[PDB]
Structure 1
């Protein structure tokens, strides 16, 4: 008769109309989802709200699971609620899905036992829905698991009884894992929202998820929010200008939650006829300001409220029963006031539990609890439980303590904290940083950035400049604007950093990092700067090249690996080399600095006051055409001693040019990396001439060329020369055969200066090695690796090699293949 799908869609449209879907909205007004501001979705590459489950570019495999992630306050849940409404209205996924079932993790227990009855609880008011009909058809339904990280209590991802069969009742934790791992209702779709930190215990369940990151407001969107929030444009302009003038707060308003907190504060000031003050710079300052205005007009119950929040964190409770409020002395008075001021909610949607408007407020109050004037009241215990799911990670609780524990405090809430306690905690927090900063290990504890966020909140140079002494090496990954302002602050207030690595992510090729580079240029301790493996396109390299010319720069080693630089950037690099007398080592490997780029780069290299000693030009798409300019540099540059030009097309007609100039006995070249240039035996006579005449050359790396036995013979004529000082000769797969063993054998006993001979993956022969074993015993000068790796031998040969190792300890290691 009548369909159910129409009734369910009607229910969803009627229910999902508000942003909060809760009371206490300053007079219990309706927020209206029409107020929703679109958030950008970036695939972990912009994507739409639809097409999330579609097959991708290759293999055409469908996507069952989509995972959305983002920071607290971004609006993961609002997006999920928007999807429910757009679907019910028939504009989103109107074809492929018959039902969307919204699961609110905050309301899901991991203690109780239940069947998959949430297909009933999430349905319209009718207590007996057709669960055994169309609702039971897999692939036509999508579950929305909103707030995975909000699940209260321990969550065990490794279980036996996965519990198939939706009609079977089992533990809430088992049931959630069963849906995520697709054991229950196979082929059903699933959308999960989570904080990035909580992925630690989710990655083991997802198997093959599609990851999407949720972004905050752009400048254009931030402005609209204020104008949509403040119905009077005259007041909207005032509010916008007050915030726009504060660069730090404007940046913070990136997160929807922050701009909301600020807007409410200003709205209250407007109504009361106040000056509309707003001077907050830190996260703590914003939250304190809000509560200061909210609770001052209450504060008499601050202790009880803080104890409630503290208990909720330690005993894993978000939803409070009236009995839990009464037990803290919070009843029939301030609770109503908290609802009126939109600090606390009643969850009036057919329920009688209370909650805080946001987890950051609950954690904020828990942070104050420890400092006021009952599970612990011990900071040590709190910090020891930081890296734990079971306590909610406590990221904001600790972060807020850093902000709250200060000396520059004023009236309203901030003055109700104990001084002696603040002093005791400040010492413990500093020790906490010292240990975590030193313990630079892979873990879920602070990862060299969260510590900066903590120090940022602690706006005190006396504390920050001291805490930063434990960060001699800074390795950070920056994806947003807040990351840059926080890292800039901490790096600037640091006098003991020796090296820095900046992993720029999907925000450079712009001015975004200009402020950070400016700070680095004034450091007197930074020696090594690593900017490899990120999109430092030419525009970014220009900014850096200008930065590196500062008189106080002091950077000696600069690594610019796979940055995707082109030949145009070599103009700016040349300018730096010609004036920067500090830079010693420069790595340009894997860029696209073709022959033209070298022609320009060589201008700086040949310039007076250029002190560069080690230059890497590996895999730079070079050909023999550039050998003339590189050769000129070797001839005239007395400072360049290490040159690596392998993995290029500098064939035999090219190496000959480098050799002709390197042959000159006044050339200071010590190490030459002609690794994979495609050299052939015809050029070995050029290498021979260099080895014979150039007494400075000590290391030659030829692995990857094709020399054969003829090449070895020619090299040996040079290597056996009395003036040859080569110490290390590397000969990996050079297409060698056993016919060259007589000449290699000669080197082993005739050479006086060779120390290492790394024969690698080639058909050297077992008989060849046996020859070496016998001659190596005759007072050989070889002390280092003899190679013979990546090849296989028979039993007797391997025994001989093992014997050689024991009979003549002077040889570091033989390196048998097995």
Structure 2
């Protein structure tokens, strides 16, 4: 315990906030097993012991916020006090898959001091819980054929071999492991898991959506009026089960209240919501952000060093302006406030009017772990090429380029309609487009409707597309 106390102290300092006190704005999330699940009992059997737990969650659903909340509660003695002597937080986006490294090196880097008692930490592996946050955010490729597997926590291995050996339970077999990932990445992960317990993060319930708006707005009057807009807008109310969406919408309505204009948000698509957020912050640095984003996705870079920023014309003062308006975050290293914003600007890179800009090359890499699957680049590309879309940002886009891309997207649907993209995913893309002329032609390529629904947003998106089928 001599060093455990020093470590828990360091954990309560880093994970005190979400970077805003974590306990202040944290709002209970909904978890379901494989029924409601309780944190303390997460590693209890039914049977063999449960060493691996997998958290499936949508982008922005709150995987990282929940991992940080667990670090904090445990460090405070509220959670797993009797179970684990150590929790180590592994931020997958920082772990190179190429650099040779030892599990000891990895543990030591989670520690505050340079010379920790690593050999003591490892004496009781069953008392360790590894928290891998954002498996999908590993940069580069990653497949089940990796090998050979390592059984020595001191031996240095390529990052991919290291993580594979850890996930397969070859390294420290009886240590516990908690992985958070987006569902799409389970294609790769599933073949390594050993008797996993799968949990699903569902986000905010209707009552928790209200709670968030009230925790966000110090003034109750603002909270209740901001939430009234949501209640009135079927699409936003439904979409606000994603906590990230709650934060985007709340931050936007905040500006309107500072401007004094009567509150009103009429967004109908995710693209509309993300455009409503950026416009509220307002044009000179527009090209720079899209270049950086497109480069980051193509070359697998989430974290951007100052050399990359100056490389794309973003001077140090320009970056300080993004931090002020909460469009950038520093973590030396800079990154986008969320990966979805990096895909949004990457999509816009193909539509700006004066990395390759040939959309056909982009679509060839769709759904590949190596590039990050490109799920939201395509969704945002469908919504941005929408002719009906109008805004100060629409003028920066090229009508000619939008037309060429609109035509290629349609050829793309025709092939896929006759693996990823599923039919439901294409419904999300078509829902972003909205244009009935486009959607009606696209919907005719499908021989049959074949979908599986889980959420209200699934129902809404698929109802919109079914209604736009031809009727004899």
Q: Note whether the superposition's TM-score is higher than 0.5.
A: yes
SS at match of 1:449: helix
Q: CA deviation at 1:71?
A: 0.9
Give me the TM-score of the superposition, normalised by structure 2: 0.97
Q: CA deviation at 1:121?
A: 4.0
- Measure, in 2, the Cα distance between the counterparts of 1:236 and 1:121: 44
Q: CA deviation at 1:269?
A: 1.4
Match of 1:207 in 2: 194
Q: CA deviation at 1:410?
A: 1.9
* CA-based RMSD: 1.6
Any unmatched runs of 5+ in structure 1? 21-30, 440-444, 497-818
Conservation of the 8 A alpha-carbon contact between 2:7 and 2:112 = no
SS at match of 1:46: coil
Q: Structure 1's 172 and 411: CA in aligned 2 closer, same or farther, altered over 3 A?
A: same
Q: Structure 1's 233 and 118: CA in aligned 2 closer, same or farther, altered over 3 A?
A: farther
Q: 1:54 aligns with which of 44, 65, 70?
A: 44
Q: Which stretch shifts more, 94-103 or 46-55?
A: 46-55
Match of 2:219 in 1: 232
Conservation of the 8 A alpha-carbon contact between 1:102 and 1:122 = no
Q: CA deviation at 1:362?
A: 0.2
Q: CA deviation at 1:70?
A: 1.2
- Superposed CA deviations along residues 155-204 of structure 1, whole A, max 9, x for unmatched, are 13213321221111111111000100111112000000001100111011
Q: CA deviation at 1:460?
A: 0.8
Give me the TM-score of the superposition, normalised by structure 1: 0.56
SS at match of 1:401: helix
Q: Structure 1's 374 and 164: CA in aligned 2 closer, same or farther, altered over 3 A?
A: farther
Q: CA deviation at 1:277?
A: 2.7
Conservation of the 8 A alpha-carbon contact between 2:439 and 2:465 = yes
Q: CA deviation at 1:3?
A: 0.6
Larger relative helix fraction: 2
Q: CA deviation at 1:387?
A: 2.1
Q: Structure 1's 145 and 374: CA in aligned 2 closer, same or farther, altered over 3 A?
A: farther
Q: CA deviation at 1:32?
A: 3.3
Conservation of the 8 A alpha-carbon contact between 1:311 and 1:374 = no
Conservation of the 8 A alpha-carbon contact between 2:146 and 2:160 = no
Conservation of the 8 A alpha-carbon contact between 2:248 and 2:277 = yes
- Superposed CA deviations along residues 188-238 of structure 1, whole A, max 9, x for unmatched, are 000000011001110111132111101111111101111110010111111
Q: Structure 1's 54 and 455: CA in aligned 2 closer, same or farther, altered over 3 A?
A: same
- Superposed CA deviations along residues 303-334 of structure 1, whole A, max 9, x for unmatched, are 11100000000000000010000111111232
Q: Structure 1's 172 and 317: CA in aligned 2 closer, same or farther, altered over 3 A?
A: same
Q: Does residue 13 of the first structure (1) align with residue 8 of the second (2)?
A: no
Q: Structure 1's 433 and 361: CA in aligned 2 closer, same or farther, altered over 3 A?
A: same
Q: CA deviation at 1:134?
A: 4.0
Aligned length: 470
Q: Structure 1's 374 and 131: CA in aligned 2 closer, same or farther, altered over 3 A?
A: farther
Question: Taking CA–CA contacts closer than 8 Å with sequence separation of 6 or more, which of the two structures ends up with the larger relative contact order?
Answer: 2
Conservation of the 8 A alpha-carbon contact between 1:313 and 1:363 = yes
- Measure, in 2, the Cα distance between the counterparts of 1:159 and 1:468: 40
- Measure, in 2, the Cα distance between the counterparts of 1:245 and 1:358: 27
Conservation of the 8 A alpha-carbon contact between 1:320 and 1:354 = yes
Q: Structure 1's 374 and 242: CA in aligned 2 closer, same or farther, altered over 3 A?
A: closer
SS at match of 1:84: helix
- Measure, in 2, the Cα distance between the counterparts of 1:57 and 1:172: 33
Match of 1:393 in 2: 373
Match of 1:361 in 2: 341
SS at match of 1:166: coil
- Measure, in 2, the Cα distance between the counterparts of 1:406 and 1:127: 53
SS at match of 2:24: helix
SS at match of 1:244: helix
Q: Which stretch shifts more, 126-135 or 324-333?
A: 126-135
Conservation of the 8 A alpha-carbon contact between 1:110 and 1:173 = yes
Q: CA deviation at 1:274?
A: 2.4
Conservation of the 8 A alpha-carbon contact between 2:99 and 2:159 = yes
Conservation of the 8 A alpha-carbon contact between 2:22 and 2:69 = no
Conservation of the 8 A alpha-carbon contact between 1:309 and 1:366 = yes
Q: CA deviation at 1:123?
A: 4.1
Q: 2:364 aligns with which of 363, 371, 384?
A: 384
Conservation of the 8 A alpha-carbon contact between 1:7 and 1:124 = no
- Superposed CA deviations along residues 526-560 of structure 1, whole A, max 9, x for unmatched, are xxxxxxxxxxxxxxxxxxxxxxxxxxxxxxxxxxx
Q: CA deviation at 1:10?
A: 1.1
- Measure, in 2, the Cα distance between the counterparts of 1:418 and 1:134: 58
Conservation of the 8 A alpha-carbon contact between 1:101 and 1:119 = no
- Measure, in 2, the Cα distance between the counterparts of 1:84 and 1:334: 34
Q: Structure 1's 119 and 229: CA in aligned 2 closer, same or farther, altered over 3 A?
A: same
Larger Rg computed on CA atoms: 1
- Measure, in 2, the Cα distance between the counterparts of 1:396 and 1:353: 24
